Write a protein that binds this ligand. Sequence first.
Ligand code: ATP
Lengths: 67, 395, 407
Amino acid sequence: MDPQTLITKANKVSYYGNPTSKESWRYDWYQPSKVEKYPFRYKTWLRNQEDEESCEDILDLKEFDRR
Amino acid sequence: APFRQDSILIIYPRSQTTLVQFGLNEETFTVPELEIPTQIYRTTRQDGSYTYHSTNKDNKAELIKPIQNGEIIDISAFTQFLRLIFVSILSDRANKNQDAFEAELSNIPLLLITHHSWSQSDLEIITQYVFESLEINNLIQLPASLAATYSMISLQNCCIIDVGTHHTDIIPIVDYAQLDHLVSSIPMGGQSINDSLKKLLPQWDDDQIESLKKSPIFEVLSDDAVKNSDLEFNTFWDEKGNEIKVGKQRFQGCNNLIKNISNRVGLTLDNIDDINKAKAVWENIIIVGGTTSISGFKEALLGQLLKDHLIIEPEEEKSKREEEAKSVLPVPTIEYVQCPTVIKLAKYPDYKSGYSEIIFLGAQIVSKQIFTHPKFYITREKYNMKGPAALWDVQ
Amino acid sequence: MMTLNRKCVVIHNGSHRTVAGFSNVELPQCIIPSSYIKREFIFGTYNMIDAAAEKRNGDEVYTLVDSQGLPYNWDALEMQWRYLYDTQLKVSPEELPLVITMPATNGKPDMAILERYYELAFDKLNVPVFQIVIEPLAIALSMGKSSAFVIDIGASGCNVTPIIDGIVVKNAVVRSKFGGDFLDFQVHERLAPLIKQKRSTDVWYEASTWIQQFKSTMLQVSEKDLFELERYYKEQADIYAKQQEQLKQMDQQLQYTANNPLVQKKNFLFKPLNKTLTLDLKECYQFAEYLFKPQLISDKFSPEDGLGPLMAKSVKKAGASINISPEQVYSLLLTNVIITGSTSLIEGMEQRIIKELSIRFPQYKLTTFANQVMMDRKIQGWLGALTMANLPSWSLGKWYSKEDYET
Ligand SMILES: Nc1ncnc2c1ncn2[C@@H]1O[C@H](COP(=O)(O)OP(=O)(O)OP(=O)(O)O)[C@@H](O)[C@H]1O
């Protein structure tokens, strides 16, 4: 199959307590709220609230298996 | 939530080749099945974007070795390389078993053996990649040193000397914890022997020196030493098949390496703040690596450690005292306030001696430890809430 | 842990140790010397040691801070922070908040220093935001003590800062010049004969290797005044000598070749020459005694410059700077005592501190805390800064921003 096809089909399993939503993050600036806002921006991981590449060929395991 | 041990995936990226294993047998001790070179081919394009391939087919190609001296020089190539491996195991089982996605590939926890040099930034990215791009719901990022000591039962304090080809890592451990401020690395390794031998054997070929280094006649001998150590000249056969006659230089070349290691281990352990903790570390020394497999290497290094760093009464002073004691017809031992009193190698209880072996052994015990009572590793529940910042949850 | 969903870069520049790390880890990423080598720059211990052992000419070793605990070379300090960031921490300065420590003082160079840090932090390193923390206050607040008496002993000397209801008493801040650096001098000078106009690298190597081993192992602190202690044991020994002689007077006998703790010897191996060094316990007691009694070394120094009177001096002065009553300020300071710094790890230092402080204050009951984790005490300032970095809200400390820095 295709790598994404293998990735997408794999790791998908449903149990009790299993999260439906896959949250995605980004490393970017943030401006802290006042507890008006503080006058500085620092970098941290933020979660995309709205849910918004190079994919190569698979390998052969026996060539890289041991002897 | 549900897990079957055949699904667990362990990856141990190294500077040259990565060891991977999929599943644990539960019958016996786990051993790395697959050994893969650590590299990826990257064809740059006009877009300014990058494309990575398994093979270049002689095209723009190049080659990216994502790991240099154990560190990560290219994070992007490393993740794609990681992705390359993960996808590869998925297809192999997919082709072998039709229902695989519903059973063995249903949930695949990933256990990644990390390196002391990896930055927080790198680790955070790797976490993001595993959960987002690889769509894996469980991840374990385990330092190799802690993994290595995990195999050693009830080993609280120790110092791992890990000798690599181009570098050697010094990893002091105290209270089951890696002290990062004291971890160091020396640009010395197995290759330093080749560089050392090339000085003393200029007429030799770089191919012939390596062939000498791995030959059975190459060993490092103690001061105490038809047997090989006794005769001046001995011989070995090259990979070409040709005989090569070599003199005293077969016993040389490792001195420069062993001294620099010893010297570095000295300062490292001297900066351990609690002597009682420090004493324990000196009593447990772990010498591991490819180079260490050379005959007499572990003994030579250990000996060199005792030579310079051991605290004991100088034989010159002790001799005069025993001589002066008589002075009779027809001696108390000196006590020192410093560390160590004794230096010895880590005992392997209940065990085979390699680094790759013990780490994987440790990785297995950890899996038993984590999955039984999880409450280290990240779960999708945390990654959704905290994100790659979930990597750090402590205190 | 990540507070307010972020992490901070904690840095501490001391006279001796410079500690840098992240606020989430709880253990420092790196500990490097507060000195540096001028060739090019070499900032690592291991990096420095090699340059020293390399024995190059034109190599020099410079302190990064004045004895007052403040940085006196900013361009040099700039190269350190780049090394700390680029090498050990491996993160860009533009990304994260910066919590650094500056020592407590009676004066207000702080505005001069803050302006100096504004440049270093912002126009130079483009740091987004940063906080400054007062080290003794950091150490105190971290320990659960809102009010305390902090005795910090280190390379520069003894730094005694009284703290009441969460703020330092500026006037009562005192700084001795007797400490780890002074002790380094005496160990070298006294032992020179026994060993059998110097390269700075050579002086630094000796101080950082065999001398540091001497102080951490050989050195002890008397629980009492050494002369007073020595006279006690001598007379106690004289009685034992007279007691044993008298038993021979009764039944007679002749020469059977017939107990003083100060005469037991401590043996320190000197590896460079592979020769043993031996000193009686009294000679080990002597070095540390000079901190409490500096007049012994020279006569240039007064008894009051000693630690014992200084601690009392600070306590008295603490009362005068609030105007409950000054006499009662003693009750709050002596009840909460914090002994920190690496030089305070010398065996028996805690007792002598209590002893010297109890003498001048017999009426008040006291209790002293000294961190029993060896490593923590050395880096305690940085750990103090770490707790401040990890505070739940931004409102709990002063943060400085591009807003503060403007034309
Ligand atoms: N185990 C030990 N025992 C005794 N003394 C030590 C020990 N380790 C270090 N020292 C001494 O303590 C001093 C280091 O003090 P410290 O690390 O507290 O400095 P700092 O905190 O960077 O500077 P400051 O104390 O002025 O803020 C050095 O002079 C060193 O010789």
